[PDB]
Amino acid sequence: MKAYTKYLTFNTKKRRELIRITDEVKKAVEESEVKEGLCLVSSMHLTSSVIIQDDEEGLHEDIWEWLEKLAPYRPDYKHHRTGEDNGDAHLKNLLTHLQVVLPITNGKLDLGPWQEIFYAEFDGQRPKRVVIKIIGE
Amino acid sequence: MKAYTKYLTFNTKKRRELIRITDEVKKAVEESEVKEGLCLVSSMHLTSSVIIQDDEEGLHEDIWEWLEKLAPYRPDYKHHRTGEDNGDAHLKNLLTHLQVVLPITNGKLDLGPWQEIFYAEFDGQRPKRVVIKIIGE
Amino acid sequence: MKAYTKYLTFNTKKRRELIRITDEVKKAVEESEVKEGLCLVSSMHLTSSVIIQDDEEGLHEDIWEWLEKLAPYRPDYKHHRTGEDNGDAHLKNLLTHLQVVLPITNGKLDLGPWQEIFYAEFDGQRPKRVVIKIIGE
């Protein structure tokens, strides 16, 4: 059986940011030479997630507003006992889920007509990685 | 290694609907002849998800009410700049997560005593697909 | 191809509880002899989930408070028609997502610097299982 691993590193210019990584993942799928298989794309951190959204602008704005609404920055989270006040970023990671698993069909990332893979940074400005793990034939 | 792919197509009679697809997935697991492996079941759209719930009626009603409560239809989402006002469906997809991964054990879908796989449509009435991707031996 | 299955059983002392199972999963990864692969860790129940959080105390308290806030116990959920009033536990399962999929790299669980796998019980005090399903080489 074939297996392929690749790590993507980000250091966003902002604390919160949406980064397209579909082509990155597609590059990995090609390198893996896998014809049929599974492709896991997961954030290795608790304050960021790999999500599948689409490209529309307005929707990107809606998700930040919904995230802030459901998992708002707060000064009083208990996590702040450590002096860290990125508690909301952890909640946003829980909310959105840290990862996605995609099919590989006929040597291709099996995506829907509008699906796009993003690295959703919730506490960036420092080096953080995303793992791509592919298995199959 | 063995790999099997199958797409399920839905065109719900309603914008929002709960559709049982466990037997569909089980049919695919049988066709794949896989003894031991993994089975990914994922929506190929941003406005629908594959979820695992159970069969109880009341709970089905609770999830729609909770979804509407956490990701309410709204006329003012920015996504509406496109004239599309299914923004809430995208949020519901984020909320519930687009997919599930299930074990295949001894040639069988490895499910809990009450687990049932559903295709949860949040903006239906048009052709949308779900991918089943199986790998293993 | 190699495949390995192991079930973890819990019967929490409390209705709601956070249980570390990272070492349990690591034990399974070792037993599987898999060098490169995927490792699914999923709750077999609708009222509990496998989540990835980190170890900080304050954050553990924040997640219970956020969960209760987003998916509060309630006496009036429709699910209660059955006399069961664990409706909130089902919602919490939806919220947090029942499972996680982890990479196996060089015979090791491929985890981030702070990632820890937990069994998050939302209606415990009875025997419930978590499945570990590993495939790869």
Written description of the protein model:
- Three copies of one chain form a homotrimer.
- The first copy, chain A, is an alpha+beta fold.
- The first copy, chain A, has one domain: Jelly Rolls (Sandwich).
- The first copy, chain A, is built from three helices and eight strands; from the N terminus they run E-E-H-E-E-H-H-E-E-E-E.
- In chain A, the strands form two sheets. Chain A has a five-stranded antiparallel β-sheet with strand order 1-8-3-5-6, with helices on one face. In chain A, strands 2-7-4 form a three-stranded antiparallel β-sheet.
- Chain A starts with a strand and ends with a strand.
- Chains in contact: A-B, A-C, B-C.
- Chains A, B, C: This is YjbQ family protein.
- Chains A, B, C: It comes from Aquifex aeolicus (strain VF5).
- Chains A, B, C: Pfam families: YjbQ.
- Chains A, B, C: InterPro entries: UPF0047_YjbQ-like (IPR001602), YjbQ-like_sf (IPR035917).
If you compute it from the alpha carbons, what radius of gyration of chain A comes out, rounded to the nearest whole angstrom? Answer: 16 Å
How would you describe the shape of chain A?
elongated
Instruction: Please count the helical segments of chain A.
Output: 3
Q: Strands across the major sheet of chain A, in which order?
A: 1-8-3-5-6
Strand count of chain A: 8
Task: Return the CATH topology of chain A.
Answer: Jelly Rolls
Report the biggest beta sheet of chain A as strand number plus sense, adding barrel if it closes: 5 strands, antiparallel
Sheet-strand content of chain A, in percent, reads: 35-45%
The CATH superfamily name of chain A is YjbQ-like
Oligomer: homotrimer
Percent helix range of chain A: 25-40%
The largest contact between protein chains, plus residue counts on each side, is: A-B, 36 and 31 residues
- Counting helices, strands and paired strands, the structural category of chain A is alpha+beta
Element-by-element helix/strand order of chain A: EEHEEHHEEEE
How many structurally independent domains of chain A?
Answer: 1
Question: So, CATH architecture of chain A?
Answer: Sandwich
* CATH C-level category of chain A: Mainly Beta
Distance between the termini of chain A: 6 Å
PDB class: structural genomics, unknown function
Keywords: nppsfa, National Project on Protein Structural and Functional Analyses, RIKEN Structural Genomics/Proteomics Initiative, rsgi, structural genomics, unknown function
Assembly: trimeric
Entry title: Crystal structure of hypothetical protein aq_2013 from Aquifex aeolicus VF5.
